[PDB]
Symmetry: C2
Subunit: 436 residues, 2 copies
């Protein structure tokens, strides 16, 4: 919103005009009148935005040449050109050479303010998404998978991605889109698992809300693009039917709508269920299944690609540090082999969760110290007492204490009795009363 | 980006010109000439972008009134206006009423393409941000969390330097950003430097910037922070040579870039954070006390998760939805049984640790009946074993005690842990544990 803006123009009245409007708005303004004075200002402190006279006469660099030098020094620094009456061609060329936009003399305030609000807003947006975009394996299976993606992507066929939960099907779907002919169209996702079965039709098909406002459903939003249906198996009965029509008709009704909307979508499905078995029990539709499954893509379980795990661990650490400010640590080779040999029912999500867990537990140890196999949980390699009121908690505790002591004495009740502080028959009676 | 662009203009020749230039470029175009045709096209299908004649002669609604209706229907659908020579005041007014930008007749292709491309890009980024935000993944009504909000408010209007102090994985960065948002620098930059994360080799460059080999310049954080606030996350991990330089910056309000000679002037308000007291930093030996005092003119304490256990259910519930979006896992009800464990734990790693454990639970119950409650036996050792619990051969010190002594130790530990769980509220603790209030007071004295 407020910014340190540098105004470079060879005319005293323009610098004064621009600087004054921008200051009046809340910005901080600096001025220059040629290449040297502009580059000296930039050197003093990089500004947030630059207004640059496109001609800039009586200067060592013309306006475009200066633009080039600015962009070389600060690639991400937005620059809006100030152009003359009917120098549209030259202005347009400035944009090819790196300028964001231009404003044409003469102008009053509102026009300039708006040009500047836009340049800053878009610049800000570019930086938020660039950061967020920060926040792929050697094995046979993953080479086959890459190979599969590349063959299947440039077709126009519906894809069904199959594999277990957590194996990273969404990533495969985005890969497909990136190499498809719809790569510059939209990529829209529907988490069929996640959305309430009630709201599912509104997410898919949209609707007119009470105010007159419209919710554009995912099909409509995906027009010209790809729709990725995640875990198609969690789709309701009436919703399956209605998607079947869409695949064939290429048309649908909005919830509560009468208009039949035409779209041109390419659908990618995924599932970790066995759908053929769901057909057999009448839970999912056969005809729907076959149309969604024309070309299949299989995503390998972590256990199918064990070779990849070290680099995956290494990768998730780089990323977890980004996401949480924790200096990444080295994993010790005994613990790494235990990671490498687990079955990973939750696959990549599960592996990430565990790596994140180790980094949290070892946050604030000597950085040269290794993550050891001691730290991994019981799954790798009924009721809690705290949920119980006093009488019941104490009874759980007596029971489990007695069982523990009994095992520690190898089943010898008389020895257990003596140690725990009871007469033998009384231990037997107590054990029975606690349900053993 | 190719896109579905509706073109709305009362002149056949303008629609033709626009739709044709846009088509040559690869877009899919549709056209209309008045409100009824424009709204029917939007009802047939929602376009990605609208060009709209600012005047729109021969129409039920003029261009401005049509802009109100389009925006009401589709608030995020960008609309670029087509205006005439000298219509700037009206164009400006269109922007106030929701238009993204305008183009002024006469125009040829290049100029029209640029306006389209920009409008599509900006609209794309607005969505791609909010989408990437959901795909990455201050809550609470506790006494402590109310205190923190009240403190943020009292402190934000100062000009003075803030030191935020609190345990790791508490949400200190968020506290920083809530302070920035209520300050007089809310419209300036907020810049973060995580001292722990940056290799100390690169710490000077990250902070103070440098001229790279190409001629390309790297703007350091301090310089980027000009006009705003710079957040020095975990200052303790800063090298002494960097400490010395920050001290000069605080008082000179100036600095040299790595390898540079210009003294860059800046106007930054520094907010700092750490997990340790002053006594701690002296004993560690790393960090200068004079600097510490100057970075901590106004203190803000971020309470540990154990000091606000009352918020654990809201945070559990909150993190489930976050995770449910970020990872495609259906959110599930945590059983009251498992919530009691979660709530009773002291969370040495605070919000990060809690979140990571909620993620864990949700991954481990991924292929279950949607009704079936999440249970405590899926929690790791560090959560379950630090609390009063059913013993096991593993626990040498319980196993060395006879039954009554073991039981009495357990009652004590249990009651203290439940008191803590309910944030010290005796009445509620008593209600849960099965006791009347005075009886609970009397039992506590009887056990020490
Ligand atoms: Mg000039
Ligand atoms: Mg017209």
């Amino acid at each position: 919103m407020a910014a340190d803006i540098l105004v470079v123009d060879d005319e005293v009245d323009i610098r004064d005009l621009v600087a004054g409007i921008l200051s009046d708005e809340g910005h901080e303004t600096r001025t220059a009148f040629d290449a040297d004075s502009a580059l000296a200002a930039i050197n003093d402190r990089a500004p947030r935005l630059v207004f640059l006279d496109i001609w800039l006469q009586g200067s060592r660099l013309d306006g475009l040449a200066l633009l080039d030098e600015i962009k070389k020094q600060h690639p991400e620094l937005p620059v809006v050109m100030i152009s003359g009456h009917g120098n549209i061609e030259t202005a347009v060329s400035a944009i090819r050479r790196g300028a964001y936009d231009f404003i044409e003399k003469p102008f009053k305030a509102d026009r300039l303010i708006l040009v500047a609000e836009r340049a800053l807003e878009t610049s800000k947006l570019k930086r938020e998404v660039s950061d967020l975009r920060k926040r792929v394996g050697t094995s046979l299976a993953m080479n086959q998978l890459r190979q599969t993606i590349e063959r299947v992507a440039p077709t126009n066929s519906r894809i069904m991605i199959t594999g277990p939960s957590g194996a990273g099907k969404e990533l495969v779907a985005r890969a497909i889109h990136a190499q498809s002919s719809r790569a510059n169209g939209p990529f829209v996702t529907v988490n069929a698992a996640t959305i309430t079965p009630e709201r599912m039709e509104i997410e898919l098909f949209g609707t007119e809300m009470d105010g007159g406002e419209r919710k554009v459903g995912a099909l409509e939003e995906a027009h010209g693009g790809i729709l990725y249906l995640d875990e198609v198996a969690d789709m309701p009965r009436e919703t399956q039917n209605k998607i079947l029509r869409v695949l064939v008709d290429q048309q649908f009704e909005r919830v509560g709508g009468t208009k039949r909307v035409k779209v041109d979508v390419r659908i990618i499905s995924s599932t970790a269920q066995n759908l053929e078995g769901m057909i057999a029990e009448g839970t999912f539709r056969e005809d729907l299944f076959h149309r969604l499954s024309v070309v299949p893509v299989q995503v390998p379980a972590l256990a199918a690609r064990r070779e990849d795990i070290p680099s995956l661990v290494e990768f998730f650490m780089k990323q977890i540090a980004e996401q949480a400010g924790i200096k990444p640590r080295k994993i010790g080779p005994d613990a790494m082999a235990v990671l490498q040999a687990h079955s990973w029912p939750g696959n990549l999500r599960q592996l990430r969760n565990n790596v994140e867990r180790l980094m949290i537990l070892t946050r604030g140890d000597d950085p040269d110290e290794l993550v050891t196999a001691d730290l991994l949980p019981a799954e790798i390699g009924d009721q809690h007492i705290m949920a119980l009121p006093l009488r019941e908690a104490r009874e759980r505790f007596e029971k489990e204490y007695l069982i523990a002591q009994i095992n520690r004495f190898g089943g010898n009740i008389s020895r257990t009795a003596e140690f725990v502080g009871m007469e033998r028959s009384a231990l037997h009676r107590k054990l029975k009363s606690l349900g053993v």
